[PDB]
Structure formats: structure tokens, C-alpha cells
Amino acid sequence: MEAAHSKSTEECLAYFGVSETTGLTPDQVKRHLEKYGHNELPAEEGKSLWELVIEQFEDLLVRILLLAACISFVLAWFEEGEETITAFVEPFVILLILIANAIVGVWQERNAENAIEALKEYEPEMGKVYRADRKSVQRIKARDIVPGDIVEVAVGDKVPADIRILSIKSTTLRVDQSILTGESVSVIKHTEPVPDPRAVNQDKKNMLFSGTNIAAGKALGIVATTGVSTEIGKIRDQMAATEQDKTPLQQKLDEFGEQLSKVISLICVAVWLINIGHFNDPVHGGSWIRGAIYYFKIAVALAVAAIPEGLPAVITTCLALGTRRMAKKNAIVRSLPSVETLGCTSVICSDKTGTLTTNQMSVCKMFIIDKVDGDFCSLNEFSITGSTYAPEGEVLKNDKPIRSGQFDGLVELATICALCNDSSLDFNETKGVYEKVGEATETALTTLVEKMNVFNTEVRNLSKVERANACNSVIRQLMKKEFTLEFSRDRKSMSVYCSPAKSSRAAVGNKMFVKGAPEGVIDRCNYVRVGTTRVPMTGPVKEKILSVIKEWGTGRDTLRCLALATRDTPPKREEMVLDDSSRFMEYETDLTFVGVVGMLDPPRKEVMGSIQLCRDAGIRVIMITGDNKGTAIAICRRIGIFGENEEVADRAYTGREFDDLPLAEQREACRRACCFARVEPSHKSKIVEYLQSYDEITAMTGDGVNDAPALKKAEIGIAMGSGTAVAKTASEMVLADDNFSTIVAAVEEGRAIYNNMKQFIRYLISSNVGEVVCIFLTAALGLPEALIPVQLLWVNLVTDGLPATALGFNPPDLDIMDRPPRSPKEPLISGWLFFRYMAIGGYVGAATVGAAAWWFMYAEDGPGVTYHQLTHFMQCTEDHPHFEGLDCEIFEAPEPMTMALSVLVTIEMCNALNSLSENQSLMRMPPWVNIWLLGSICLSMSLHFLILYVDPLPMIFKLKALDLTQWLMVLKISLPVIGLDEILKFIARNYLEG
């Protein structure tokens, strides 16, 4: 393999020692295959169904539950017999939540798609080569093609390896490498070497890239690199060497797990110490075995009370909803977990042409020389109208209408436009619009022609399909297009050789019409054309031309300028080598300037507003274009990235200036830059790394397979809905309408989603805190189980999930896009907030335990234990004589439990209202603000009545409905919650740090 683009035609055949007429020999093929390997992109992640499920049981919180479901399965099995048929219900429900939960993880994943697998498609199944054992061409599998052997490709064929072209069999060879370079039109290939050893792929005119298509022609070539060493295999290597972090929330989740693990084990050490007097008890006492069942059975209650089981459900249904909500605004979010790391974006690098602008070119101004008398000079500037490609508009000189024929300068400018142009128009009936056929800036030229019919040829007497290429084909019949010197970035221009048509145009027949960048072609102009006559380019005339070119392309117009010229007396046809673009700049010299054409790519309207919102939201926007740095900047000023008068010396670099910088200033330029002139893929990936070294959340746009490694590296890669499918699969989101204003509409929902999603998380987390306080009082004291695991699940999954998912429908703040981007290191609960849940929890923990111990003691209808030990329920059946006058089975009564479960369920609807806002009082922000919330609270309550009054339900949850007075006890305990928090909110607002 090797950098063949520069060597030559023989230096390559020699390097490998292979004959262009024989190919590689069977022995060579064997050795080469051993040294370079097969022509493939490496294998895949052999992730097995067994490992995928094991991945499921590696979370700390999922393991903690699995252990509990076991301890609970052993209890609800052996020790505990008869008197209960529900044993196993507890272990069974926990297992469902797990195994069922793991299905989510395995389905979710099986439907996921690898960006690196998307490339595998750009590989032809087979290829055509010339081996040294058959004169006929053989057609083997692309997999066996090797560096060095002679390959043949023709139209349709998809290039099998990176090939260095030896000789073109056809008259012309056209390749389509848009996916790998971004070039829209099929490009022309050659055989002569490219001197530069560090050329970009756009300039390796003598190379075929594995993965592209042969648009036109047939040619032979020697295979340079194979498999992973090809321009596409090198991309596969960057996307694979790259590592995806994880949405900050997923990080805060690993953090919460580690903690909710340390705390749990502490709670047991604590509970154990609180009950240390037991080491001061009778050795023969008894109940020894019952005590262990109490602690083992409270361990399962502790675990299902600490972990928020409904959450994974509430979060993914909140995202899936928003997903659909964004999709109505052309933002197709692929990865859900990524909706969070969007609200946090601080920098947005967008591509210009398709996303920032319309990419719908049109000429607005023209100008030809009118007089050149010594140092005096007068131009002839025109204005044209029409923004579509539609041949409808007029040419107005000085605001005033004009007939283009009346100017001779304008007769030529119009041919150079219709002759030096590979693109045309087309009118369809389907949508009744004029559709650009070839290129955007070329089709804009044929359109210019139609609007200024210099010959005034009749046309209103024609249809619309035809009207399209009317004035153009009349000029096509006046000159005969011999050949054409294609565009190449070296000279930045193109031309066409044209001889006349008949004796009606015999005079000075052979002409050469060239159009290119102004600086370029104007240096090669020895004359100017004033009408039908001619003069020598002189200092004054040249400065008068270059200035107007500056105003047009740097002024508020931000027009892209084209200079058109002609080579009056071209070289003899025979004296031209029409197959080596290197010499092409020699044939386009000694020109006579004819005029320049200034066109415009109108920027999408809503873009100008989107840029403004980012200014307010505190997000930095970087424009990445191709325009020279002069107009690249101008475009920034027009849209808002830069101020009309704002300085831009250190905030706008070109790909070259940036490279010339030392790693230090390079990294410093990235924290202030807002526009990058001419950059390639190399650059898009470096800027991400620098933007990342400042711990920034960056968005990046792309469409080609060459944009894949950069989209994967940016926190959120935004692929174009019209770009390749490999880009889409390496991106978090896809802009259906390639509109930049769509990104900003998506950075807003992300902030909205996360704000709501932030509330319901704090909510659910706080109720878990309360259930833990309860279980911890119940055991520290010795009291009888107030709350059972089965009940807690119902609550965490259903009765709390409903008020939880409804909080996701909260009204978005009105200043969401006036605040800076959120920091990813912002914790969900800390400072004062940590203290309110610390207090609210401590409250419900008391309310639940208490409301149960109440029905025991000061209970209008139940046992009774004013101040004595109802806590020693463990030791009674045998201690009935000692303070125990009654039945030792009341301690398994349902009333106490449904007492404490009703105080939890209601203290939860209360807390769901305190959660409509972090610090806003309920008087200032009423519950009816969110209807879904109130409506879910009802469904929760009724859902609560269901498991009390039904039949199999009250039995399996161990709950017996409670009378109307016991319900009023629940309210008198619960409701005051809304007060304890209203008071805590008042604190935060008033007395405190704002």
C-alpha cells in the first residue's frame, strides 16, 4: 500500500513489481494477502445474548434488589408455613420488575444500530481484476483483492479498494465521491500525478476511493491501499478508537447508586446498635429464630423502600413523549438519554450552505466595462431580479428596466454564461416549479441568461416546460462547444473551447470562454473588452474592477463573485493536451476581461432569529464554511454571529491560519472563534477536542461519511436529514429539514424536558426517603411492620408513578431561553433543598409509623397500649401473664397497615403539589396550573380504593378498608405536609441567598 496519489504511473507498478498487462501472479497474490491481509473492515462486537442480560444485573441498584428478592424468597418459603398462601408474592413481584426490566434493556439494544456497521455497506461484494494467469478479466470477491494487483472498473461499479488510476480506457472518467468529500457533482479523474504528498482527498484527481461510484467511463488501475488502510477504513478506525462518555444524568445515577449503597449498609449498622441491649438478655430466652426473620424481613422492606422502582418508567415515557413532541418540529431525536445533554449545549458548530443558508443561488448584480480612456474608467453595473431559478425577472441598470440586447458587453457575458456551464434548468408538472438540474451556482447562470435574452428572441409564446432552456439553447446553436477544461481548485476556474457554427459566425471563430474566481482570472487578463472593441488591462482599470469586487463580496451584499473572460485567440487545438489539468492554467491565459456576475445564497429567514435566541440563551455559535475568509466573515455579520462594526481579527480563522498556529494559540483560538473559513475534516475533529478541553458541551453538524468521526466525537452530533445514512447513525439527532433554526428549537425542548424531569425525579426520590425513615423507625423501636414491601412497590410503581409522569407536563418557564446553559455538574439535590427532603422525609417517616402505632394504642377500636410495651410483640404468646392480656395475633392486623399506607398515599398527593415549583408558594402557583396533575391524583386515589375494597387485592396487600373516622385521622396526619413545605419554601425565597 502507499501514498500512490503522488508517485506516478510507473513508480507504482514498480513499487509493487507488477505488470499492467499481466497483473499479480498467483505467488504474488499469496504473499501480498499475508502481508496486507484481506480487503475488509474488521469484525464486530460479539456481544452475546448471555452477556447482554448479565449486563442487566450489574447495576448496583438492580443487584441490591436481586439479593432482596432472594432473602424474601427464602423467608416467604420455608420459615413461615400455612396461615398464608401469599408467601412468594413478594419474591415474584420483585423478580418481574427485574427480569421484565431486563427485557427492556435487551430489546432496546437489539434495535440499536452501529454507525460502524453502516459503512460495511459501502463495500462492493465483488471486484474485477487482471491476474497473471488469465488474459480475460476475472470477477472475484472484493475481499480477496490485494494491494498491488491490476483492477478494472466501469460505470455502475462501486470502487472495491483505494485505487491509483493507471490509464483511462473510456474517453472520460466521472466519479461520484460526494459521501467521502462532500462534492455534489460527479468529478473528473486523470492519470498524471499530484506533486503534494499532503493533499486532501478533494485534490487527489488520480485516485478512486473505495466506496464511491463510477458515474461515467471505464478505466484500469493498480490497487494502492486495502481494507483498513483506505480513506474509508481510516474513518472506521477513528469512530472505533473514539469513546462515548454518558449523559450527565446517567453519571448522577451511578453516583446516587454508590451512595444509596453506603447509606443502606450504615442504616443496618445503626439499627444493630440501637438494638444492642439484646446482648444483655437471657441466653435461654427463646424467639432466637423469630428475631432473625424479623431483621431479614425488614431488610427487604428497606431495599424496596430505598430504591425508586417506578422512575426508569417515568423518565423514559417522559422522553418518548417529548421525542414525539420534537419530531413534530422536524427534530428527529434518535438516542433518548441524549435529550438531556442538549439542554446543556453551550456551543453549536453548524455547516453553512445547506443549514444556515438556502443553497438556492441567484445572480443579483452584473457589471461590464463601459469606457477606458487612460486613467478614466466607467463600469456598467446592473441589477437583476428573481430569487428562484425561475426564468422570471428583469435586468434594471440604474433601478430602471433595460433590454440586455442594447449592450454588446452584455451579449458576451451572456454566452460565457450559457457555454461555460455544465448545468441547466427543468420545469416539472408534479410541483409546477422550475428545478435546478446541475449545480447550484451554475444553474443560477443559465437562469441569468433566460432573464436577459440578449437576442430578444420571442418566448412568451411558449409553454413553461420549454420556457426553461429557451434563450440558452439559442446561444448553444451559435457556438459549437469543442471541449472543456474542468474546474480545479489549483487555478480556481474552468473554460471551454468553442468554434463557430457555419459561415454565419466564421469570423475569428475559435474562442475560449473562461469563468472563475476574480483574483484568479483577472491576473491572467492582458486586455479588457469595452463593448465589441478591446483595450489593454491597465493599472487604473484593474483597481476599479477589484474594488467593486470587494464591495460586492464584503459589503452588506455578501455576494459570491464570478469573473467571466474570453481568450480571443486561443492556442491551436492540436497544441493542447486535453488530459492533464496541470497545463490547464496555461491555456487560460492572455485573456480579455468581459465582466463579473455577482450571485446570492439567501440565508434561511428564521435563521436570523435563531442566532439571536442563542445570544440570549448564552450559547456560542460557530460557522464552518468554505468561503474565503473575507465573505465568510461578511456572512457572519449579516446573520448575527458578528456585529456589523464588531472587530473580528481574533474570532475568525481559516483552515490554513489555524494549522500554522502552535498547539497553544490553537487551543486559545477555539475559546473565542466564531467562524472557520476553509477547513476540512481534520479541523472539525480538533476543534471538538479543544472545545472539550474547556469542558464544553458541543453540537456538530455533518452529512458525509467523512463527518462521521467528528459527529461521534462531539457531545451531540446533528446529522442532516438529507445527508448520508452513515452520518445519521453516528448522530444523536437528525435535522429533518436541514434547518439551523431546528437545532435551536431542539435546544429549547431539551431545557424544558430537563426542568420538568428534574421535578418528578426529586419528587419520587423524596418519597423514597420517607419510606426509609419509616422502616428505620419501625425497626429501631421494635414496633410491628407498619409498611410491607408489596405495598411499597404498588406505591413506587403505580400510585406515585402517575403523579410523577404528570409533573413532566409542567408549564415551561418563560425565561428558559434567557438563562445560560445549565452546568452538567449541577447536582439535583443539595444545600437547602437537601434539607427540605431531609425534613419532609423525616415527617412522613413519622406519620406512617405513628398512624399505625395509633390504631394500636389511642385507637377508638383496637387493642390499646397507652405507654407500655406494644413493642415487645415478639415475646407474648409465652409471656401473656406479663403485660399481655389479649390475643397475640393482633400484631398482624391489617388496620394498622392500611392506616400507615393511607397516610403515605395521601402524603404523596400532597407532596406532588408541593412539587409544581421548587420555591413558588401554592398560592402564587396553584395546582390547577397543571391539569394532568390533579387528574392523576384522582386516578391514584381511586386506584388506592381499588386495592382496599376489591377481593383478591385487599388480601394480597394485607389491607382492610378503614371507616370514615379512621380516614379523617389519615387526613389530619397527612395534609399538614403542605404546610411544613410551604413554610420551607418561604424560607428559601425570603431569608436566604435569593
Ligand X SMILES: C/C=C(/C)C(=O)O[C@@H]1C[C@H]2[C@@H]([C@H]1C)[C@@H]1OC(=O)[C@@](C)(O)[C@@]1(O)[C@@H](OC(=O)CCC)C[C@]2(C)OC(C)=O
Mind telling me the catalytic residues? 351
Which CB sits closer to Na ion, 576 or 719? 719
> Quick one: which segment of 182-190, 458-466, 467-475, 680-688 binds Mg ion (CB under 5 A)?
182-190
Name the one residue in this structure whose C-alpha cell is 494502492: 224
Round to whole Å and give the CA distance between 319 and 336: 6
Sole residue written with cell 370514615: 964
**Under rule CB under 5 A, residue 702 binds Na ion:** no
The answer to whether residue 310 forms part of the interface with Na ion (CB under 5 A) is no
Cβ contacts of 257 within 8 Å, gap of 6 or more: 59, 60, 61
Q: Of residues 19, 251, 259, 877, which one binds ligand X by CB under 6 A? A: 259
Residues of this chain, 833-872, that bind ligand X according to CB under 6 A: 834, 837-838, 841
Residue 852 phi/psi, 5-degree rounding, is -80, -50
C-alpha pair distances (Å), 25 with each of 14, 133, 159, 577: 15, 7, 22, 35
Among the listed ranges 375-383, 706-714, 822-830, 939-947, the one in contact with Na ion (CB under 5 A) is: 706-714
* Minimum separation from the CB atom of position 302 to ligand X (A): 9
List of E strands, 727-783 = 733-735
| Residue 159 or 710 with smaller CB distance to Na ion | 710
703 is in an annotated binding site: yes
**Near ligand X by CB under 6 A, which window of 70-78, 257-265, 356-364, 864-872?**
257-265
Q: Which residues are within 8 A (CB) of 209 and not within 5 positions of it... i.e. 6 or more apart? A: 159, 162, 177, 180, 201, 230, 231, 232
Binding mask 72-101 for Mg ion (x = CB under 5 A): ------------------------------
Q: Is the CB of residue 404 less than 8 Å from the CB of residue 423?
A: no
Query: Does the footprint of Mg ion cover residue 354 (CB under 5 A)?
Result: no
Q: How far is CA 4 from the centre of its chain?
A: 36
Radius of gyration of the chain from Cα atoms?
Answer: 39
Q: Which is nearer to ligand X, 240 or 264 (CB)?
A: 264
Cα 385 to chain centroid, rounded: 38
Tell me the window of 115-123, 255-263, 574-582, 669-677 that interacts with ligand X (CB under 6 A).
255-263
Which window, 238-246, 586-594, 662-670, 823-831, contacts ligand X (CB under 6 A)? 823-831
Minimum distance between the CB of residue 686 and Mg ion, rounded to whole angstroms?
16
Nearer CB in complex with ligand X: 709/824: 824
Which 3-state string (H, E, C) describes 633-650?
HHHHHHHCCCCCCCCCCC
**Distance in angstroms (rounded) separating the CA atoms of residues 334 and 733:** 5
Binding mask 696-735 for Mg ion (x = CB under 5 A): -------xx--x----------------------------
Least distance (Å) from Mg ion to the CB of residue 237? 19
The three grid cell numbers given for residue 360, joined into one nine-digit string: 438556492
The verdict on 709 binding Na ion (CB under 5 A) reads: no
Distance from the Cα of residue 287 to its chain's centroid:
62
Stretch that binds Mg ion, among 179-187, 261-269, 742-750, 875-883 (CB under 5 A): 179-187
Contacts of 749 (CB under 8 A, 6+ apart): 322, 325, 326, 329, 331, 339
How many residues in total does the chain contain?
994
> Which residue intervals of 871-930 are DSSP H helices?
894-913
Question: What's the count of helices (H) and strands (E) in the chain, helices before strands?
Answer: 36, 26
Residue among 472 and 915 whose Cβ is closer to ligand X = 915
Shortest Cβ 607–Na ion spacing (Å) = 24
Q: Which of 28, 210, 729, 768 binds ligand X (CB under 6 A)?
A: 768
Judge contact between 138 and 129, C-beta under 8 A.
yes
**Segment contacting ligand X (CB under 6 A): 629-637, 715-723, 825-833, 878-886?**
825-833
Which residue from 76, 214, 260, 699 is in contact with ligand X, where contact means CB under 6 A? 260
Give all strands of the β-sheet with 207-208 in edge-to-edge order: 138-141, 126-130, 150-154, 218-225, 162-167, 207-208
Q: How far apart are CA 404 and CA 24, in angstroms?
A: 63
CA 590 to CA 577: how far, in whole Å? 18
Residue 559 Cα to chain centre, angstroms: 31
**Least Å from the CB of residue 184 to Mg ion:** 10
- Smallest separation, CB 839 to ligand X (Å): 9
Give how far the C-alpha of residue 282 lies from the chain's centroid of Cα atoms, to the nearest Å.
68
CB of 340 to Na ion, least distance (A): 14
Using CB under 5 A, which of 127, 598, 717, 803 touches Na ion? 717
Is 707 annotated in a binding site? The answer is yes
Buried-exposed string 535-557: b where 16+ CB fall within 10 A, e elsewhere:
bebeeebbebbeebbeebbbeeb
Residue 276 Cβ, how far from ligand X at the closest point, in Å? Answer: 22
Residue in 263, 506, 975, 987 binding ligand X, rule: CB under 6 A? 263
CB-count exposure of residue 624 (10 Å: 0-12, 13-18, 19+): buried
**Cross-strand partners of 563:** 516, 596
**Least distance to Na ion from the beta carbon of 606, Å?**
26
Sheet holding 620-624, edge to edge: 331-333, 733-735, 716-720, 698-702, 347-351, 620-624, 675-676
Q: Which H/E stretch holds residue 91?
A: helix 89-95
Stretch that binds ligand X, among 227-235, 253-261, 381-389, 536-544 (CB under 6 A): 253-261
According to CB under 6 A, which one of 256, 407, 658, 843 is a site residue for ligand X? 256
- Comparing CB distances to Na ion, the nearer of 685 and 906 is 685
Binding mask 299-318 for ligand X (x = CB under 6 A): -------x------------
For residue 899, give the nearest of 987, 741, 808, 783 by alpha carbon: 783
User: What's the rounded Cα separation, in Å, for the pair 702 and 182?
Assistant: 10
Binding partner of residue 717 among ligand X, Mg ion, Na ion, none, CB under 5 to 8 Å per kind?
Na ion
Nearest CA to 819 among 612, 610, 609, 616?
616
Binding mask 390-419 for Mg ion (x = CB under 5 A): ------------------------------
**Site membership for ligand X, residue 760 (CB under 6 A):** no
Nearer to Mg ion, 516 or 704 (CB): 704
Q: Which does 182 bind (CB under 5 to 8 A by kind): Na ion, Mg ion, ligand X, none?
A: Mg ion
Site for ligand X in 892-951 (CB under 6 A): none
Residue 735 C-beta: closest distance to Mg ion, Å: 14
Q: Check if the beta carbon of residue 721 is closer than 8 Å to that of residue 703.
A: no
Q: How far is the CB of 326 from ligand X (least distance, A)?
A: 24
Cell of 516: 472563475
**Which CB atom, from 118 or from 485, has the smaller least distance to Na ion?**
118
Among 326, 829, 870, 900, binds ligand X (CB under 6 A): 829
Residue placing its CB nearer to Mg ion in the complex, 236 or 751: 236
Residue with nearest beta carbon to Na ion? 717
595 close to 407: Cβ distance less than 8 angstroms: no
Number of residues that bind Mg ion (CB under 5 A): 4
**DSSP bridge partners of 513:** 566
Question: Which of 765, 925, 941, 943 forms a contact with ligand X (CB under 6 A)?
Answer: 765
761 binds ligand X (CB under 6 A): yes
Closest CB to Na ion among residues 712, 728: 712
Q: Does 988 bind ligand X (CB under 6 A)?
A: no
For 218, the grid coordinates are 471505464
Site residues for Na ion per CB under 5 A? 712, 717
Can you say which residues are annotated as belonging to the binding site for Mg(2+)?
703, 707
Site residues for ligand X per CB under 6 A? 252, 255-256, 259-260, 263, 306, 761, 765, 768-769, 772, 827-829, 834, 837-838, 841
Can you say which residues are annotated as belonging to the binding site?
703, 707
Site residues for Mg ion per CB under 5 A? 182, 703-704, 707
